[PDB]
Structure 1
Amino acid sequence: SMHAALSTEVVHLRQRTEELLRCNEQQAAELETCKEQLFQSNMERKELHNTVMDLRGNIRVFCRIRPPLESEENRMCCTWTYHDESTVELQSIDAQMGQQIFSFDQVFHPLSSQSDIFEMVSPLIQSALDGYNICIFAYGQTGSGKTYTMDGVPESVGVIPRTVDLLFDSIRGYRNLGWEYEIKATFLEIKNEVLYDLLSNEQKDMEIRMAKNNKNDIYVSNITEETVLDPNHLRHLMHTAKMNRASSRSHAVTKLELIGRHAEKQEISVGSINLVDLAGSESPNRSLSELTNVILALLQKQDHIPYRNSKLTHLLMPSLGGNSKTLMFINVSPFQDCFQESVKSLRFAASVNSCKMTKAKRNRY
């Protein structure tokens, strides 16, 4: 009577046990399959993203909105409506005709980690090894993330360090192929329309001039041509330069010139990686005033283009023209007090988004 009752219940529960374990097994089998498919999908989606951006041409504009830090709680924060992964719109908390919705190549949410940011940039660096000039720029008001995105903090490294390792990994496989790539370095700081070499602590006078090789590229003199040795050597040179830099509103122009040496045949790759940390979008515009003019130039002007008025724009004269992938980070603060400046940064980003197609060279001489 009792011994009957409870021995049935035992069996009944053995049924929920093996059912809740059967369903528990297949859930994990689907779940493992779903994530891989989701990775594979994200892979083929970022592939086509690079593949589309490529055909549109050679100027890319990414927009990264910074999250309020632990110091911003009651600070007024403008409304932010993310319509797509490439289209975003900001709204003034107060009252309100103008452009408020903005579409770029890729818009990064505050949540996006430094890894995701560099994940989209990675293809360009890799392209520099196959003979290609690359230039990365960080525009925006101060506090928006220009240092955070371009460079990186200790915990989350930025684009600058992330490329270092990525570049040496590729170099490793290329040495094996017989391609002995050589990495060089050039760190300089146009603080106030004056170049100041960050690798050379001794004061010098850089002078930007039509690169003697060809009118197409434009080199610079009095600059420490430091031949990089390994990932951490460059991490040493990174530290070196930030030391000299110390800054808030200055153009830190880094030029990791990338050469190649193939044992199969005397060919040489060209990798003009140009990681530039602009600063000061808000109105004081020392060199950044002419940056908006070369940009508005490439939109209107064709062959004719202002090349001076900004040491920065004269260094970048290889890019503006052609054979150079240009990518600009639009770091923008999410606060209502900076709502107008944020719009200003997004207006410049829209003109950058509307810039002309630049060609590309095999750069394999």
Structure 2
Amino acid sequence: MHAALSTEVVHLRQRTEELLRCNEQQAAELETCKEQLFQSNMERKELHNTVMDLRGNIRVFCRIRPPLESEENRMCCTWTYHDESTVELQSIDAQMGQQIFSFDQVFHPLSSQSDIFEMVSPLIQSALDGYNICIFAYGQTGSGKTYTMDGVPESVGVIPRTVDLLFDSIRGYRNLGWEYEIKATFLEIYNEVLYDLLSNEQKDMEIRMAKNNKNDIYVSNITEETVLDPNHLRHLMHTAKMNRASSRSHAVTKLELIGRHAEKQEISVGSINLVDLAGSESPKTETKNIKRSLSELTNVILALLQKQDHIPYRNSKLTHLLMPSLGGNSKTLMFINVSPFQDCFQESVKSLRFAASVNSCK
């Protein structure tokens, strides 16, 4: 019947016209809501940045690790916590002035990995909002550096926790229209010489100005993996640590967050630089450059603090590598790891001595 079809058409055009209409109102609401969400996050980002500014763009921490179940009769020095920020160490040698230092926070032998991450988590957000972060673990060998950054399968550290935070955040960000991409890169620094950790073929790399920014950095010939998913990253990390076989080398692991918002044509890029510094201990029993680097690094932070105008980042491979992350907007976390034992008293006092020169900068 032609009349049936004719009637089904007229109805069809009716449902189509009603749907096109109701369909254009959603498009309209979706639009404003989109705009107000972008605008809202934007302010949220700024409100977050203010809080980071108020707690400090450069904060120093202290972490005396618990003693190992295998060597304990080496009477740990005498530790006293004058408050959750100030700590003092005395030696058990029967008779300097005193040895007391202030931090932004002090973690004792019972502070869990989870507890230290809580000092870092806020920064994973800043990196996602386009800021650069640097996280160091400074101290003598055996004091706690590696266990703090990487950790142990039994109890994980800063880096593994950051990746879980990253992917969880990144995943959520999608609901805002941001598509994030992570650039992974791992490297080492023995004698002012850079070594890639995702390859074996020796190749000479070097720090050079970046394409679209003479202020940014670029390491030529290094492996820069574009993370596919957390499996891909887990593979990369395990693979990295693999070839890392030391306490006289600087291990840097950089994750660069490239956020791309398509419909708003806005781009965001921040970076996390997790550094497992080399032993700060003094030579006893040739290690020229290792004392250079560490001092250069601690001088650049001290400069950054007193707002020194022209800073010589190039005076060292490391300080040159992290230069764009030691800049203005940047935030820097510094974990001073320490050993409780007697034999480390003088060494431990050396480490801690950075806490005084940091705030004496006022």
TM-score class, shorter-chain normalisation, is 0.7 to 0.9
Kept in 2: contact 1:53–1:105 (CA 8 A): no
Kept in 2: contact 1:191–1:250 (CA 8 A): yes
Number of aligned positions between the proteins = 354
CA shift for structure 1 position 300: 5.6
CA distance in 2, matches of 1:193, 1:11: 79
Deviations 1:168-223 (A, max 9, x none): 00011111221111111010100221100011222221201233432332332221
Q: Which consecutive unaligned segments of at least 5 residues does structure 2 have?
A: 284-290
- Residue aligned with 1:187, SS: strand
Residues 315, 14 of structure 1: alpha-carbon distance in 2 compared, 3 angstrom cutoff: closer
- After superposition, residues 173-184 of structure 1 pair within 5 angstroms as 173-184=172-183
Residues 260, 336 of structure 1: alpha-carbon distance in 2 compared, 3 angstrom cutoff: same
Residues 188, 28 of structure 1: alpha-carbon distance in 2 compared, 3 angstrom cutoff: closer
Bigger mean CA deviation after superposition, 296-305 or 44-53: 44-53
Kept in 2: contact 1:295–1:351 (CA 8 A): no
Kept in 2: contact 1:136–1:327 (CA 8 A): yes
Deviations 1:53-110 (A, max 9, x none): 6225310111111110011210131111111111111112113444511111111111
Instruction: Tell me if 1:301 matches 2:310.
Output: no
CA distance in 2, matches of 1:17, 1:180: 34
- The aligned residue for residue 138 of structure 1 is 137
Kept in 2: contact 1:46–1:120 (CA 8 A): no
Residues 328, 109 of structure 1: alpha-carbon distance in 2 compared, 3 angstrom cutoff: same
Residues 12, 220 of structure 1: alpha-carbon distance in 2 compared, 3 angstrom cutoff: closer
Bigger mean CA deviation after superposition, 266-275 or 91-100: 91-100
CA distance in 2, matches of 1:132, 1:70: 41
- The aligned residue for residue 259 of structure 2 is 260
Deviations 1:244-264 (A, max 9, x none): 110222100111011011133
CA distance in 2, matches of 1:96, 1:19: 92
Bigger mean CA deviation after superposition, 263-272 or 96-105: 96-105
Bigger mean CA deviation after superposition, 229-238 or 294-303: 294-303
Residues 250, 266 of structure 1: alpha-carbon distance in 2 compared, 3 angstrom cutoff: same
State the TM-score, normalized to the length of structure 1: 0.80
Bigger mean CA deviation after superposition, 121-130 or 15-24: 15-24
Residues 89, 37 of structure 1: alpha-carbon distance in 2 compared, 3 angstrom cutoff: farther
Deviations 1:221-271 (A, max 9, x none): 221110012223212111111111102221001110110111331111112
CA distance in 2, matches of 1:278, 1:81: 27
Residues 296, 58 of structure 1: alpha-carbon distance in 2 compared, 3 angstrom cutoff: closer
- Residue aligned with 1:329, SS: strand
CA distance in 2, matches of 1:261, 1:4: 54
Instruction: Please provide the CA RMSD for this pair.
Output: 15.3
Bigger mean CA deviation after superposition, 294-303 or 267-276: 294-303
Residues 34, 261 of structure 1: alpha-carbon distance in 2 compared, 3 angstrom cutoff: closer
Deviations 1:262-309 (A, max 9, x none): 133111111211111101111232521322332344456711222223
Residues 142, 261 of structure 1: alpha-carbon distance in 2 compared, 3 angstrom cutoff: same
Bigger mean CA deviation after superposition, 305-314 or 108-117: 305-314
Q: Which consecutive unaligned segments of at least 5 residues does structure 1 have?
A: 356-365
CA shift for structure 1 position 122: 0.3
- The aligned residue for residue 8 of structure 2 is 9
Bigger mean CA deviation after superposition, 133-142 or 86-95: 86-95
Deviations 1:299-324 (A, max 9, x none): 56711222223211111211333121
CA shift for structure 1 position 22: 63
Q: Tell me which protein shows more strand as a share of its residues.
A: 2
Kept in 1: contact 2:45–2:129 (CA 8 A): no
Kept in 1: contact 2:37–2:176 (CA 8 A): no
Residues 215, 75 of structure 1: alpha-carbon distance in 2 compared, 3 angstrom cutoff: same
Kept in 1: contact 2:78–2:90 (CA 8 A): yes
Kept in 1: contact 2:189–2:251 (CA 8 A): yes
CA shift for structure 1 position 336: 1.1
Kept in 1: contact 2:49–2:126 (CA 8 A): no
Residues 218, 22 of structure 1: alpha-carbon distance in 2 compared, 3 angstrom cutoff: closer
Residues 38, 144 of structure 1: alpha-carbon distance in 2 compared, 3 angstrom cutoff: farther
CA shift for structure 1 position 45: 19
- Residue aligned with 1:181, SS: strand
Identity %, equivalent residues: 99
**1:331 counterpart (323, 334, 337):** 337
